[PDB]
């Protein structure tokens, strides 16, 4: 049982400029001290992404639909885990296969499975006043799950799930792929030491899991964790957060290494023309001088094509409008040569009770060149 | 599974006896393409994707890749490259019913051709006409989908054929599915024909000081060639000139 | 080859009911259910068809909404629940048989059951 | 939508002679999509032709349909006491498979 979440003031969504951020490894192949071009779905540098809170302060419960057009960046400010997983699928109303991943304390869930989605999932903490603890309250995500076989498990210890005061200091980092089969979620952590920003620097994306799903996925939600201590439909409090949501696209990425395996720092070509003759010159400094990167090419906007026109037009208009029809023994023919056709002639009228054609039909081959044409 | 609902199942951290399917020999067609059959099967995949259906003898030629048919086009397609096995055997005793069986069904028309892989399940009317009709079958609007209808008394071409597709990725880096032939035998420091994930080579074993991940198994220095394989490098023996 | 329909339905208006009518082995799956109400004293109007294969079933736009269609695939029995008794809704609906398919184009009604009438009473 | 209209609602007359039972509609039928019913009284519609004139199983071929276009005809050759029934028309083109109104009804 979902219960709709009221008492929220709508606010524009907000927006924020995302620097050198969301470099994965391409491949499971150990490189070191190279300079390696890769043709990949990334996030370009200097982007924008959406940014979305949860502030205690209308509550700012952000939790809307978002699309899932090629992969999906998710960045997550946290000092008290808030956001417990997402959601993914194409309607969410159990008429087609979905998905969900779930941080539960006793053991990660991701569930493959038809869901009955409601408007607003969630997760809810209680917080009691007797004593200082904090246990998870309420779980409103789904209601049905039938046809369905992949399920899962893990090891998570408990953590925290208490609301501290301060500034945010964790910042999780996914990628998640829809690719041939394959949902790959590739994740990393970082202290930060911000308050409210989108922290800098430039951080490797290590592969967490490869799920072999194969489903079909357009829509997807984010599921936030609020803190309860009046109405339960109405009321709620959110938690101090943030999360950043970013698309990915096809771009072509140089990424430098280091003597460890991690990745150091990475360009993109099409960023602007210093990256582009960087991935030129394959590598990160480029000397002064003059140099041939691209080539610009006008693309042509549309196709032309002009014939000669109609100048001989075939007399079928004597055949089917003649005065006098022969018997059916004395059959009468007449042979059609040397004219262009008017093949929109036999059906607009449709006076034929048959334009029932055979082989030819009636289309663009009937309006084609004909060797002989015998009525 | 039918033609037009191939289902699809993960071979995934097992071993594999590509032998025993080779040594059967009661399948109609074994055929291969980009592996080599007669026990060169046995190769570590990243993956190994098998799909199955029932499809009519005839039918058989276009599941080939770059093929063209209505299976191909509005059933099911296999990509150009194809590093996998198409297999097929005559299932007339188990799939054909006495009276016909109309268990298996073929898209007989679809709006446009597939992807190299794709799964439509959709029972949309198919449109051969101006009028909408509404998504019942009327004039020039028909069910998309058709019947088979396999008989025991009935042409080898109208006979069931159950077909299994075996595809096999070939990128080797996570190596889930690999021959039980080799053993490790504990060889270093010589000039050895090392094989780790199917892929062969020759060269002397050595100890790695370099640091992998838990998801890297494979490691190419510069030009692209093998260098360090899960920790162990990899360094040719001794050669030049005279 | 046999399609038994449900008895007479002694239904008060506004008193929803649900007819049965019972296909024969190999009915369903090869072909398509269609339901014509048959008004008394009057003509035969096609309420819409049953596909009980894929569960598709498609209404005309008068019935949209005032009748829903079930089939069950398991004992093969076919199924129109009636949303409540309207006072014209007094009928014999009929159950028969339909091709659903390509290579037969005529979708005409094969097999007639024997038909079910409802009323304000018996 | 294409609407039925049977041409002769009570030219039978408890008939003793062949019949020329007819429907026309608004757009033309297209390619044959229609068929006849014989709804014996008391009884549901029994199958009559399909097609234009494609006969029907356990059916005497003395049933003749003989249409085109406008679909129009159901001739009995002989006629027989017990065949009196009611007869209807279905058309398959773009209609909710819709019928006529009947045409032997008393």
């Known amino acids: 049982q979902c219960v709709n979440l009221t008492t929220r003031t709508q606010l524009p969504p907000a927006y924020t400029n995302s620097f050198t951020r969301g470099v994965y490894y391409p491949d499971k192949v150990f490189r070191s001290s190279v300079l390696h071009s890769t043709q990949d779905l990334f996030l370009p540098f200097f982007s924008n992404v959406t940014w979305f809170h949860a502030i205690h302060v209308t509550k700012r419960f952000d939790n809307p639909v978002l699309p899932f057009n090629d992969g999906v960046y998710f960045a997550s400010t946290e000092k008290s885990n808030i956001i417990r997983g997402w959601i993914f699928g194409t309607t969410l109303d159990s008429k087609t296969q979905s998905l969900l991943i779930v941080n539960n304390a006793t053991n990660v869930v991701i569930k493959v499975c038809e869901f009955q989605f409601c408007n607003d999932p969630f997760l809810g903490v209680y917080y009691h006043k007797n004593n200082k603890s904090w246990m998870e309250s309420e779980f409103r995500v789904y209601s049905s799950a039938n046809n369905c076989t992949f399920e899962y498990v893990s090891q998570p210890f408990l953590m925290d799930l208490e609301g501290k005061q301060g500034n945010f200091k964790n910042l999780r980092e996914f990628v998640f792929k829809n690719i041939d089969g394959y949902f790959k979620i590739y994740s990393k952590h970082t202290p930060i030491n911000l308050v409210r920003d989108l922290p800098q620097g430039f951080s490797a994306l290590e592969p967490l899991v490869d799920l072999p799903i194969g489903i079909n996925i357009t829509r997807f939600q984010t599921l936030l964790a609020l803190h309860r201590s009046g109405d339960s439909s109405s009321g709620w409090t959110a938690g101090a957060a943030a999360y950043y949501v970013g698309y990915l696209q096809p771009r072509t990425f140089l990424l430098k290494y280091n003597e460890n395996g991690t990745i150091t720092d990475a360009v993109d070509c099409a960023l602007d023309p210093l990256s582009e003759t960087k991935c030129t010159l394959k590598s990160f400094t480029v000397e002064k001088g003059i140099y041939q990167t691209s080539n610009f090419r006008v693309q042509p906007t549309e196709s032309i094509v002009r014939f000669p026109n109609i100048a001989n037009l075939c007399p079928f208009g004597e055949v089917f409008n003649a005065t006098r029809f022969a018997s059916v023994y004395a059959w009468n023919r007449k042979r059609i040569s040397n004219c262009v056709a008017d093949y929109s002639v036999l059906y607009n009228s449709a006076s034929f009770s048959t334009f029932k054609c055979y082989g030819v039909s009636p289309t663009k081959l009937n309006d084609l060149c004909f060797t002989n044409v015998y009525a | 599974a039918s033609v037009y609902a191939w289902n699809r199942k993960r071979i995934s951290n097992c071993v594999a006896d590509y032998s025993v399917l080779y040594n059967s020999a009661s399948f109609s067609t074994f055929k291969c393409y980009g592996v080599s059959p007669t026990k060169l099967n046995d190769l570590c995949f990243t993956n190994v994707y098998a799909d199955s259906f029932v499809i009519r003898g005839d039918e058989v030629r276009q599941i080939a890749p770059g093929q063209t048919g209505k299976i191909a086009d509005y059933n099911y397609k296999l990509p150009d490259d194809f590093t996998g096995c198409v297999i097929a055997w005559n299932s007339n005793n188990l799939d054909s019913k006495v009276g016909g069986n109309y268990n298996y069904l073929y898209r007989l028309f679809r709006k446009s051709n597939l992807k190299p892989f794709e799964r439509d399940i959709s029972t949309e009317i198919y449109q051969a006409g101006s009028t909408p009709c509404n998504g019942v079958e009327g004039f020039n609007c028909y069910f998309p989908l058709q019947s088979y209808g396999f008989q025991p008394t009935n042409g080898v071409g109208y006979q069931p054929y159950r077909v299994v597709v075996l595809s096999f990725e070939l990128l080797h880096a996570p190596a889930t599915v690999c021959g039980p032939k080799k053993s490790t035998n504990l060889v270093k420091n010589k000039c050895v024909n090392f094989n780790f994930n199917g892929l062969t080579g020759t060269g002397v074993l050595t100890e790695s000081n370099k640091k992998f991940l838990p998801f890297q198994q494979f490691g190419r220095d510069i030009a692209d060639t093998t260098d360090a394989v899960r920790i162990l490098d990899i360094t040719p023996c001794s050669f030049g000139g005279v | 080859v046999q399609l038994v329909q449900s008895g007479a339905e002694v239904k008060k208006p506004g008193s929803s009911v649900k007819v049965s009518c019972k296909a024969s082995?190999?009915?369903?799956?090869?072909?398509?259910i269609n339901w014509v109400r048959q008004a008394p004293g009057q003509g035969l109007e096609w309420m819409g068809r049953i596909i009980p294969m894929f569960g598709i079933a498609n209404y005309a736009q008068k019935f949209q909404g005032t009748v829903t269609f079930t089939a069950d695939k398991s004992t093969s029995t076919a199924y129109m629940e009636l949303s409540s008794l309207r006072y014209e809704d007094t009928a014999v609906y009929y159950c028969?048989?339909?091709?659903?398919?390509?290579?037969?184009?005529?979708?005409?009604?094969?097999?007639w059951g024997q038909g079910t009438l409802v009323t304000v009473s018996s | 939508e294409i609407v039925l209209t049977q041409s002769p609602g009570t030219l039978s007359l408890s008939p003793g002679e062949r019949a020329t039972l007819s429907c026309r509609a608004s757009?033309?039928?297209?390619?044959?999509?229609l068929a006849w019913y014989q709804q014996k009284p008391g009884q549901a519609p029994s199958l009559l032709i399909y097609?234009?004139?494609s006969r029907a199983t356990g059916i005497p071929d003395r049933f003749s349909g003989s249409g085109s276009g406008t679909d129009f005809t159901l001739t009995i050759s002989r006629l027989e006491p017990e065949d009196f029934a009611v007869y209807y028309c279905?058309?398959?083109?773009?209609?909710?498979?819709?019928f006529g109104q009947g045409t032997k009804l008393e």
């Open positions: 082995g190999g009915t369903f799956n090869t072909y398509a």
């Open positions: 028969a048989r339909s091709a659903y398919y390509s290579e037969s184009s005529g979708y005409y009604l094969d097999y």
């Open positions: 097609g234009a004139s």
């Open positions: 279905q058309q398959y083109v773009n209609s909710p498979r819709t």
């Open positions: 757009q033309s039928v297209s390619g044959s999509y």
